[PDB]
Amino acid sequence: TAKKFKVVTTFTIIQDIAQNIAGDVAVVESITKPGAEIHDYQPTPRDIVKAQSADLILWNGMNLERWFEKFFESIKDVPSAVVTAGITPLPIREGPYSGIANPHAWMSPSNALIYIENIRKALVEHDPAHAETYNRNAQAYAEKIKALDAPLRERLSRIPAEQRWLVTSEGAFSYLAKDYGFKEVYLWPINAEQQGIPQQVRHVIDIIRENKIPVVFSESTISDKPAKQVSKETGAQYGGVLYVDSLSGEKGPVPTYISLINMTVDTIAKGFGQ
Ligand SMILES: [Fe+3]
Numbered sequence: 001t002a003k004k005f006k007v008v009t010t011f012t013i014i015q016d017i018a019q020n021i022a023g024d025v026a027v028v029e030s031i032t033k034p035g036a037e038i039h040d041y042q043p044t045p046r047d048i049v050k051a052q053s054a055d056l057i058l059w060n061g062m063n064l065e066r067w068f069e070k071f072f073e074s075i076k077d078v079p080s081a082v083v084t085a086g087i088t089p090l091p092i093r094e095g096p097y098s099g100i101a102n103p104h105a106w107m108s109p110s111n112a113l114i115y116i117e118n119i120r121k122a123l124v125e126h127d128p129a130h131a132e133t134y135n136r137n138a139q140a141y142a143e144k145i146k147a148l149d150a151p152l153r154e155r156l157s158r159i160p161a162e163q164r165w166l167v168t169s170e171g172a173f174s175y176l177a178k179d180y181g182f183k184e185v186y187l188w189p190i191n192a193e194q195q196g197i198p199q200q201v202r203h204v205i206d207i208i209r210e211n212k213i214p215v216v217f218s219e220s221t222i223s224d225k226p227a228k229q230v231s232k233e234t235g236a237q238y239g240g241v242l243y244v245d246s247l248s249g250e251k252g253p254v255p256t257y258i259s260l261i262n263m264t265v266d267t268i269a270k271g272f273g274q
Pocket residue numbers: 039104170172191245
């Protein structure tokens with residue numbers, strides 16, 4: 001066992017999933033730090049250094065990292081793989097990014113199985129000497145992810161179907177909302193420039209009042225202020241922060257992809273009184 005195979009990922013969700021597949025035979029690191037906004041992140045010379053010293057670079061694609069393709073052109077002789085191949089996308093419904101794929105495919109545990117398979121295939125292709133470890137680790141991790149779905153689905157099924165409105169800040173939850181039968185309301189369709197402008201807040205306030213939706217949420221890499229303004233002006237309580245674009249730090253409450261899915265579903269369910 002000389003040097004560990006080095007994988008660099010764009011952001012922390014892919015880092016944790018890939019590290020579960022790498023296990024003992026590769027080290028995986030994320031370019032963005034926990035809590036950093038990932039869509040419009042601005043890479044630094046230090047990020048170039050980290051990617052250039054990797055053996056493999058993984059990214060989401062589906063229009064998540066607006067920075068990645070320009071950044072990767074600086075990187076020489078380091079293979080990359082997009083980890084969302086074979087996932088059917090949901091289009092963004094409104095705004096200047098209307099009609100392109102919603103990048104947040106990982107919030108569906110069924111989709112996470114495809115992420116696992118795509119990351120396995122890339123490690124097996126570019127570090128073939130450890131293919132058996134990658135294959136074993138991916139099989140074990142896919143088992144955990146697969147088993148993850150049933151308790152989540154049952155938990156959220158307790159909410160009456162006609163009351164299943166998921167009101168958030170970024171429209172980051174489209175894939176989870178589809179899986180578990182939630183209607184989707186958000187203050188902005190995808191992180192970009194306009195985030196909490198009028199018209200956006202007003203439309204959400206109208207849908208809240210018309211349907212008497214009981215809770216609204218923010219997310220861990222963006223500002224909670226638009227969501228708290230919406231709850232102050234309506235009957236809805238502020239449900240707290242969901243995790244979608246970043247894990248927490250390793251010593252925080254959301255250190256892993258599994259903990260992120262569980263925490264986000266629990267926080268939603270609590271916002272509806274379980
Ligand atoms: Fe996002």
